Assembly symmetry: D2
Homo-oligomer: 236 residues x 4
């Protein structure tokens, strides 16, 4: 199975697999059962912004999600990612729906990775930004139902004509491998931002959006729909 | 008195004011008596590199100092800087000598600050880099004995002709105020790197180099030589 | 007198001092009488975006101004700025009104400068961004009528209560000097972006907004209102 | 055949295919017969640094190559690349040897691309840096004889044990496609830097190093050794 480090924006409480009894932001380490969560309140149809950062000295993955004029929700978790992830990863977003549904629209996405080795190189770095998406994005690996629409949004899950579809899954990974640790490595860091638009006609949205880091050859696991956010093959 | 948040590379153990019994990297919050330290071994006359990062969600100031081919020393400390620092600060380096002495040469320095407010601006940012210093650096506030030499090094303490001088103090602050928190602020971060060259003809070097963040109008306090690193007026 | 290199977004044709018979973007070298212009059509009350870039090998200052869904206006001019500007400059925006008037609102501003010397340093660099302005921006030198309003816009000229005022002048310079050439310099570059909002209740707006680079101690010259854009003391 | 825009650092004069009678930096547009060149003097065994920049408003590709303490060689050429290149490209370095030989060692490489569309997005961007190369660089497409050595240099052509080999060709492309123009595009830019080490035991080195931009699926053309720099299938 894949190796997954993820930040989930979780729109639908699944109490049987560890979700708290409310919508929440979470830190996922090799499991859908978040290691930490914070209460977060979806604002139907508004543009949200998520920020994720980490560095290998501090060893603390943090995430914060906000809406305009509104107070934010943040979460943190002490973790040494370099003992978890492989040296080379891909990064991405995913989203899913189940019996309940929502738009999982990404409006923009940026990422930065830095590796600083002893000698004293500013040793290797990657920064990408998208503030909209090309109708045919050649630098994105599109998985499952993910596509870009003609407003240049990235629609991670199916929408037929304003209307989000149930039991949909989709993921976009940046085309280049990222080098996240090395043998002669002194400090590695990353920071990602994405803005997103979650809308539902139902009183209850599902299932969420996640930012995630995985083995380079990660693909959507079998059985990963709805609650498992296209990240995991099961709920362990 | 000034408000000081600093990372010290401390070359000389002052056991009467809290230094551990070895050279050490430290985190200083409003006091010379570090809140956290880690053993570090000065390599006389080699080029060292220090990295410092922080963000306001994770709330963990970390620092790591390394030399080429060598293992590093890191330190961390959980702190909410936004409850400590003012909204606007300056950033800088300082150094001092006392009865013992060393070159406090900076070879390069970069800094990044980011403030992200709710609305969803990438709201305000500053990045500067120097990989050498102009003989007359108009974007640096030079304090005390700080000057740039004709190899374009920043000599924070006095050197007359290869030879570091005792009881010297010096500081360089970047000319622009940095905006580190706001009312509508969601996350603030910074990262600094500097490379430095500490040399002594004595068996024992003193006193150290620090990176620091202070009120914009911070200046060298009276009585801040030697052990107090040009950061503090006393040892409380 | 000051040394001025500027890109003007010129809203009002002054045919007696060289303006073409239409609103226009221009390149100004030590004179209000642009060295090059291109036709540009103000869209009353829309948000515009201007981009300016230069590097010292290519020796070609270019500028382009656009509005959403609309085609842009670009201009270029072959110039060696390093033989014109001093080694250290400040950068800024200015704006003016005269008998005719407009809002000269800046919504955001970013700038980048890079100097690469032979040895092979990435030798010195500055990047700043603002996507809104602090009610009390300590890293901006505010001149004349320039102020930030409570939406965090930078109002370069006077507006009393929705309404732009006639015979107003204002400028904002970034607080730090920029190092634009050196003796051992191989290539120097800069790029600036700003977004702006020009509105008038009159059929005819005046006078314009400019991005500009000047001696560090540049201030608004006497007699520089209206057509001279707060850049020049006269029209030579 | 491939579509090639390249900057060549050309170590060996081939007078029968248009080379001037000296080592030279050149701008190549769809042909090995440079559109512009400047005299450049290889310094055997020193570390050189090359800078390349372009933007689509100015429409002027420029390049400059320097060695430490030394004066540089620059070249420029007025070209609209967006009418030449496809919307999506890859970028890379290549090098070759023939009957004469040299090390074609890259010590570091960085690239930046920016696309700014009307609406007013900072619309899409890529920045990568390498200051050394991983023994197994998963984010580089290695072609022909290109490999990384155990000092973490990128050896574009064969070296067996200090000694550069004759009739060798090699190329490294960054793994991700770059988006260089769009339909709603206002301005596109890029800047690349690389540092390199060319050494020969012969009195006469050959053949050179190039930075290049090509269709995403570009590979080494048949018959492109020696003088054609691994860029072209012939000399037209
Ligand atoms: O989209 C929300 C949820 O929908 C499904 O679970 C159900 C939520 N309400 C139900 C009602 C009936 C049945 Br059968 C099911 Cl599986 C469900 C499943 O797809 C869950 O994974 C998902 O989290
Ligand atoms: O530079 C090292 C140290 O030198 C001075 O302290 C002394 C170290 N050895 C001594 C021996 C005698 C006397 Br008096 C003094 Cl003050 C000292 C003081 O300046 C200290 O602040 C400094 O840390
Ligand atoms: O704001 C537009 C213009 O207004 C003034 O010029 C006039 C434009 N129409 C006029 C009508 C009468 C008189 Br008096 C004047 Cl000075 C003007 C002057 O302030 C000009 O500098 C400015 O460009
Ligand atoms: O490496 C330098 C040059 O070597 C070859 O050309 C020759 C240079 N001197 C020669 C002498 C004899 C013969 Br046969 C040849 Cl092909 C050559 C060819 O490989 C050229 O493409 C290359 O530019
Ligand atoms: Ca859930
Ligand atoms: Ca001490
Ligand atoms: Ca005018
Ligand atoms: Ca040749
Ligand atoms: Mn959950
Ligand atoms: Mn100490
Ligand atoms: Mn004009
Ligand atoms: Mn040639």
């Amino acid at each position: 199975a894949d190796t997954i480090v993820a930040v989930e924006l979780d729109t639908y409480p699944n109490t049987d697999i560890g979700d708290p009894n409310y919508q929440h932001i979470g830190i996922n380490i090799k499991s859908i059962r978040s290691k930490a969560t914070t209460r977060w309140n979806v604002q139907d149809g508004k543009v949200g912004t998520a920020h994720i950062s980490y560095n290998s000295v501090a060893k603390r993955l943090s995430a914060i999600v906000s809406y305009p004029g509104g107070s934010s929700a943040t979460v943190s978790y002490d973790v040494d990612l370099n003992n978890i992830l492989p040296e080379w990863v891909r990064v991405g977003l995913s989203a899913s729906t189940g019996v309940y549904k929502e738009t999982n629209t990404i409006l923009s996405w940026s990422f930065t990775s830095k590796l600083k080795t002893n000698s004293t190189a500013d040793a290797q770095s990657l920064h990408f930004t998208f503030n909209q998406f090309s109708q045919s994005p050649k630098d994105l690996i599109l998985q499952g139902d993910a596509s870009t629409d003609s407003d240049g949004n990235l629609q991670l899950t199916r929408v037929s004509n304003g209307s989000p579809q149930s039991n949909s899954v989709g993921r976009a990974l940046y085309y280049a491998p990222v080098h996240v640790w090395d043998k002669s490595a002194v400090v590695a860091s990353f920071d990602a931002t994405f803005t997103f638009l979650i809308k539902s006609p139902d009183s209850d949205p599902a299932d969420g959006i996640a930012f995630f880091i995985a083995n380079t050859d990660s693909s959507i696991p079998h059985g990963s729909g709805g609650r498992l956010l296209g990240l995991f093959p099961d709920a362990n």
